Structure formats: structure tokens, C-alpha cells
Amino acid sequence: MNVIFIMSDDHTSQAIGAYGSHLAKLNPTPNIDELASDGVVFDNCFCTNSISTPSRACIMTGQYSHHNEVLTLDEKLDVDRQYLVKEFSKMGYQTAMVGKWHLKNEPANFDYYKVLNGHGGQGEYFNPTFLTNEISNKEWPKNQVKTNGYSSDVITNITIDWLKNRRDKNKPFFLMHHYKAPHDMFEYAPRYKYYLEDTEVPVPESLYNQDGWGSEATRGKNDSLRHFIGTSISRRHENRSYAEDYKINTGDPKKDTYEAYQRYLKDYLRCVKGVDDNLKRLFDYLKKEGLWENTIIVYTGDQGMMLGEHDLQDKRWMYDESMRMPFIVRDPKSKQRGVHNDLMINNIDFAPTLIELAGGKAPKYMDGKSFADVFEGKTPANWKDEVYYRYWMHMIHHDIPAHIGIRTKDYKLILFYGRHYDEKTMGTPSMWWLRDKGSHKVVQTPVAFELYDLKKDPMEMKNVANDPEYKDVLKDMKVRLAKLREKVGDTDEKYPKIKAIIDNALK
Ligand SMILES: O=S(=O)(O)OC[C@@H]1O[C@@H](O[C@@H]2[C@@H](O)[C@H](O)O[C@H](CO)[C@@H]2O)[C@@H](O)[C@H](O)[C@@H]1O
Ligand SMILES: [Ca+2]
Ligand code: NA
């Protein structure tokens, strides 16, 4: 069967109505939700490394970051590591890649590609330029075309145009359809400027209240690093915030945070609307063409994002809003339609599961395993009850310390080792646009554990690591985290300073 893998950029699960967050009363994704009403909504899908390039590498390879070597936004994915597309080409599929690529190297293993180029692979919201192999008289990365209009509209037209005029109608196709929205700074199409103009976006209480959240690793001893760690919505963080970026000055510091939250969320949801409106045009074409009944469709985001919760922004954090990815699959031949699923899955599991759903076998060389049996009503054999996470990009871009962690259905334990893996990067500025105006440095940050009871406290408001009545859960989770790190091979032999910190904190 055909496969269309749709992925959006920073489209987090709270901003999708089918996940029923406090934002769901705004009805932000009516078309995505309709697809979910005829498919499976995976409630426990998680990123292993919440940034675009590492997450997109885990999806393509089905392997953890330390195995594909794409640790941060600074690394490249080898052309020979394009396992997902290659495995579909082996099965006789024609393959196409459209939209945001962000894997640095050429999508050479795709028969057709037309991917975003400018701004380090992030693209532009208006008149974006693409690198494509329909201009075959040039070579990567000089095979550039220009387009007219808004990126979400242009990208949707590229995919539909390929399906209509370039696709071989007698071969099954595997298409990766990647959007650039709703990425910052959320430059929505001008036709949405007054969408949600007179509607208040529901505000979480964690935006203003953070008592019990965090530790010395994320706030410092006696809250001395509240100005230093974690970019904010309020003017808490001294160097980067939405209140400062939006130049909001009410006189009341709390109303500053509120207005910056409204602006951040409305501009963001305006981009989400543009994606959702475009998907109606794509889904209408697939239905009219008759591909709706023989095409497996996936909607996901490369990672989640903090939408102001705990006065945080962006991703990278292991916190559930950034760690969890939205993941909706419609298998038109499965009886699992209009249901939710609680299975703990990862983005590294996407590739082998999609290979088996298309009539293949889960590749042995991948860390991820197939959960295709879910679409047959079965629980996969010996499936994990825990997930591994690691953010490597210490301090850079958003002043977020590197950390590892493990998450079960009931508990989450985070270990911040607060150090960058590259010694040459230690000591250097974290934000390049403030290299002149005084940015923070990629320095060592306090090492500490954070522990959250996901059944009593799913919003992760209360760190209960120092709590004595959780000290048995604490020792238990520290054991599973050490063996999970051991089982996946992320033992940091390559990095001595980091190995000593993690090994000594676990033992
Ligand atoms: O692609 S994402 O992971 O969804 O976004 C990550 C972004 O990282 C920083 O933006 C930098 C730019 O400052 C730099 O010029 O180019 C690189 C190209 O990868 C990134 O775009 C953050 O400043 C941004 O907020 C975002 O988190
Ligand atoms: Ca992203
Ligand atoms: Na887009």
C-alpha cells in the first residue's frame, strides 16, 4: 500500500484537538482531528531527542542518536544512512521527499526531492527556495528553484503536483510530506491575521506558578540561575524571551507574560491553521483520486514544544510537552479506526513499523522495533514499558542543559549532567546573535535529578526527588535508567568528563 508520512515542524500535541489539551476548545486542527477520527491516536509517543535534525535522523534511520551520530543540530546524517527511504525502494516503491529536510546532506536515495534550503535548512515562510532534482542540469546544493507564495500553500501544491503529474500510477509510492510551520517566529499567512483576534487562548497556571517544579539543575541553588537557564515567556530569562522579543511593556510584569503568551500562542496557532487548512486540500485530492482507501497516512511533529508551560519555550526539554510527539496513523485496511492507544513508542520505531505495514520485515540493524500488531488489535510481543531520552546540545540556542532520562507510564526521572560533549564548544557563547551584546556561555550547570509522578502530577508541577517518601521510587528509577543506558549502548566511552558525572550520579 501507499505511504504518506506527514510531519510538521514544532507542531506539539497540545495544539492538536484530538489530544484534548486545554487548547482543544479553540478547535485548532479540525482536519487533522477528522483524520484521527478514522485512525489511531497514539497517546504515548515520545521523541528520543527533541530537536529537528536529531529527531528527523532517528525517524529516517530507526536508530538512536548515538548510533546514527546525529546528536544535535550541528551534525549531518550520512547519505548512506537514509535507511527508511532505501528500505521502501527495496520493496519496489517510488520515493519522494517534499518540504523541510534539515538533514544537511542530499536526499540522494529519493527518486524525487524538493526540499527547503535557506536559513540553514529551515526555509522561508514567504517565497521559499527549494533544492530539487527536477533541475537535474545542476547538482546539490546548487539545484535551486524559486517559488511564489506562503510556504504551507507552496509545499502542499508541490506534493499534489507530484501525485498528479510525476507519480507513476502503477507503482506504490512512499512520500514524506514535511511542513515548515508552525516553527518560530510563526510568520503566518496574512489571510489569518484576525483568526483568534477576539478569542482568549486558555492560559495554563504553570505559566505563572513554578513552585515545586525543577531543581538546582534547572534553576540553580536558591534560584540563582532563573535568569540564566531556560528561555521564557516572561522576562525571567535575561537574554531571550517572548515578552522582550515582542516588545511588550504593560508596566505590570504579569500582564507582560500574559500578553506575550497570547501573542506567542495566536501567531503559533495561526500557523497551525494554515497547515490544517492545507491538509483539507491534500485530503480532498486523495479522496477524489481514490488514494484515500489504499494509502496509509501518518501525521506527526518532529518533536513537541513548550507552549509557555512552566514559563518555558521551544523544545529540547525532556518535559512531556516537548518530549511527547503527536502521532496519528490511518490504516485504511485496519479495523482500528477512531481509537486511542497507550503503547509507549518512540520515533525510532517509526521506520520498522511503516516497513511492516507496507508488507515488509523490521530491519535488524535498527534500534526501533515494529508495533504494527497494534493495527491488528494485538499488543506487540515483549514491548518496552519504558523509553529513553537524551538531549545533547548543552546550553546552545535556548540555554537548556544537557540531560538524560527515562519515562514509564507512571514515572519520569531526569538526570541533568549539564555539560557539552565537545570540549571546544565549552566556554563559547550559547547565542550567536548575542555574541556582541553579551550572551551566556556554554558552561557547566549544576548536576541534579528531577522526578515526577505522572499519575498524580501529569503536568509535572512538583519535583519529588528530595521527597523522602519517594526515595524508593527514586532508587528504583535510577536503576532502570542505568540499565536502559547500558542496554542501548549510550555509555559515553567517547566522552570521559560526561561518563564520570553520569556514572557517579547513578551509582
Ligand atoms: O529546527 S528546529 O530544531 O525545530 O529549531 C531549532 C532552532 O534552533 C535555533 O535556531 C538556529 C538559528 O539561530 C541558526 O541561525 O540556524 C540554525 C539552523 O538549524 C537554527 O535555525 C533557535 O534560535 C530556534 O529558536 C530554534 O530552536
Ligand atoms: Ca522542529
Ligand atoms: Na510550511
Side-chain angles (χ1 to χ4, degrees), residues 1-163 165-170 172-204 206-215 217-220 222-287 289-332 334 336-360 362-434 438-440 442-470 472-474 476-496 498 500-503 505-506:
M1 278 191 299
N2 308 308
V3 164
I4 297 189
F5 187 94
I6 313 168
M7 183 154 68
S8 282
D9 190 352
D10 292 353
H11 194 187
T12 186
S13 65
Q14 310 91 277
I16 289 172
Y19 280 89
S21 91
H22 62 134
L23 303 170
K25 67 171 287 181
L26 299 183
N27 190 26
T29 58
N31 286 293
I32 292 164
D33 293 355
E34 191 186 341
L35 169 80
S37 74
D38 197 40
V40 182
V41 181
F42 292 87
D43 300 2
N44 288 309
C45 185
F46 297 100
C47 205
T48 55
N49 192 349
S50 289
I51 7 177
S52 172
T53 306
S55 182
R56 290 164 197 275
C58 292
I59 293 161
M60 174 66 64
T61 66
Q63 295 171 331
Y64 289 101
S65 305
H66 52 274
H67 288 160
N68 62 49
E69 313 199 69
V70 185
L71 306 183
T72 66
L73 295 165
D74 284 319
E75 278 80 32
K76 300 183 169 68
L77 179 70
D78 289 358
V79 171
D80 46 73
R81 283 189 156 114
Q82 283 156 20
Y83 299 145
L84 179 51
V85 53
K86 278 177 120 161
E87 288 284 12
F88 265 88
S89 310
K90 203 204 198 124
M91 287 190 275
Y93 282 66
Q94 51 185 337
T95 62
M97 174 68 223
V98 168
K100 187 183 165 169
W101 176 241
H102 216 204
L103 286 171
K104 314 300 188 61
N105 289 334
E106 189 184 4
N109 290 291
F110 279 95
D111 303 316
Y112 177 91
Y113 68 83
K114 189 158 179 175
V115 299
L116 290 162
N117 180 29
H119 282 107
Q122 302 281 8
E124 296 89 28
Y125 267 114
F126 295 95
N127 300 352
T129 60
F130 295 84
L131 303 182
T132 173
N133 71 331
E134 71 198 12
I135 167 179
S136 34
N137 46 321
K138 298 205 194 298
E139 270 176 20
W140 180 281
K142 283 155 183 175
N143 47 348
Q144 177 177 294
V145 299
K146 309 157 168 139
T147 62
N148 290 323
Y150 185 66
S151 70
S152 301
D153 299 332
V154 174
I155 286 168
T156 306
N157 282 5
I158 296 171
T159 286
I160 297 176
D161 283 348
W162 183 88
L163 295 164
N165 311 321
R166 281 287 270 286
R167 156 184 64 112
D168 182 9
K169 269 148 191 177
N170 292 119
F173 64 90
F174 163 82
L175 179 273
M176 298 196 84
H177 182 63
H178 289 194
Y179 283 109
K180 169 198 166 41
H183 196 274
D184 66 57
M185 288 292 286
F186 324 109
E187 305 175 289
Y188 51 87
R191 74 183 180 268
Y192 298 115
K193 189 181 184 180
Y194 316 103
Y195 173 65
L196 299 184
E197 200 214 353
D198 289 294
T199 301
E200 186 181 59
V201 174
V203 181
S206 72
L207 176 72
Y208 311 118
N209 179 30
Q210 294 100 50
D211 164 87
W213 166 94
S215 64
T218 52
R219 314 152 70 130
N222 203 37
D223 283 356
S224 50
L225 300 171
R226 294 292 276 141
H227 71 104
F228 189 83
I229 295 174
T231 50
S232 56
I233 319 297
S234 68
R235 262 184 193 86
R236 165 183 63 82
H237 193 278
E238 78 170 303
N239 275 333
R240 172 156 181 186
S241 79
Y242 282 120
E244 179 65 23
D245 278 355
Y246 295 137
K247 304 155 213 177
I248 290 182
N249 288 278
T250 65
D252 190 346
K254 193 180 199 198
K255 215 42 140 163
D256 280 359
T257 314
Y258 170 81
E259 297 287 353
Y261 174 88
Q262 295 296 316
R263 171 73 183 276
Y264 166 40
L265 258 295
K266 288 189 191 195
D267 288 358
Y268 173 86
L269 289 170
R270 273 151 195 154
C271 295
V272 166
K273 190 79 190 169
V275 167
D276 195 78
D277 281 353
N278 269 281
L279 286 174
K280 175 159 175 55
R281 301 205 283 107
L282 175 63
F283 295 165
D284 282 352
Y285 166 82
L286 300 176
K287 288 160 184 177
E289 180 80 355
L291 298 163
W292 195 250
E293 287 301 319
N294 56 16
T295 297
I296 296 169
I297 299 175
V298 179
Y299 189 80
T300 184
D302 52 355
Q303 3 77 192
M305 187 156 76
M306 309 302 302
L307 291 183
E309 300 100 340
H310 318 300
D311 192 21
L312 297 177
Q313 54 155 292
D314 207 74
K315 48 267 192 189
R316 305 155 191 267
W317 291 112
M318 195 193 169
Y319 298 125
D320 248 15
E321 289 90 345
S322 164
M323 180 182 173
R324 163 174 286 108
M325 316 159 59
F327 195 68
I328 300 154
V329 183
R330 175 178 179 274
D331 184 2
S334 169
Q336 300 294 318
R337 319 283 277 278
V339 298
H340 287 243
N341 190 284
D342 61 346
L343 195 73
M344 305 281 291
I345 58 169
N346 281 123
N347 55 341
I348 61 166
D349 301 315
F350 293 173
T353 306
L354 290 157
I355 288 156
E356 266 182 30
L357 283 168
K364 324 181 141 67
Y365 56 90
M366 299 180 172
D367 299 322
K369 311 212 95 49
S370 175
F371 53 91
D373 284 331
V374 163
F375 301 88
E376 218 59 79
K378 315 186 207 292
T379 311
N382 311 297
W383 198 256
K384 51 190 168 175
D385 71 320
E386 62 204 355
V387 285
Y388 187 56
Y389 183 92
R390 176 161 192 167
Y391 173 61
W392 294 79
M393 208 171 192
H394 181 65
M395 278 302 289
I396 316 147
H397 292 142
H398 282 270
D399 289 353
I400 295 173
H403 53 281
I404 60 163
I406 183 174
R407 191 203 190 275
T408 69
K409 290 196 183 168
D410 311 300
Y411 292 102
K412 185 192 280 177
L413 174 70
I414 317 173
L415 169 64
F416 295 85
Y417 59 91
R419 144 167 306 277
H420 196 280
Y421 58 98
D422 179 24
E423 285 294 321
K424 304 183 193 173
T425 305
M426 287 299 289
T428 62
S430 58
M431 303 176 181
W432 61 265
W433 59 96
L434 291 178
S439 161
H440 298 151
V442 192
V443 293
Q444 165 79 64
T445 54
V447 177
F449 284 95
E450 299 191 354
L451 173 69
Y452 298 97
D453 194 305
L454 303 169
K455 280 283 204 284
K456 194 176 22 156
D457 178 39
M459 311 315 291
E460 298 170 307
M461 305 290 286
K462 192 165 188 166
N463 171 31
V464 292
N466 294 10
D467 195 307
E469 83 146 331
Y470 276 98
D472 279 312
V473 169
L474 191 34
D476 189 59
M477 289 292 280
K478 288 166 73 166
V479 161
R480 289 172 73 165
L481 180 56
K483 198 181 121 272
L484 189 56
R485 211 173 80 91
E486 160 178 280
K487 173 170 141 62
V488 304
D490 191 29
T491 44
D492 302 324
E493 269 88 61
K494 211 163 295 151
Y495 314 105
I498 287 174
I501 300 174
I502 297 177
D503 282 304
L506 292 173

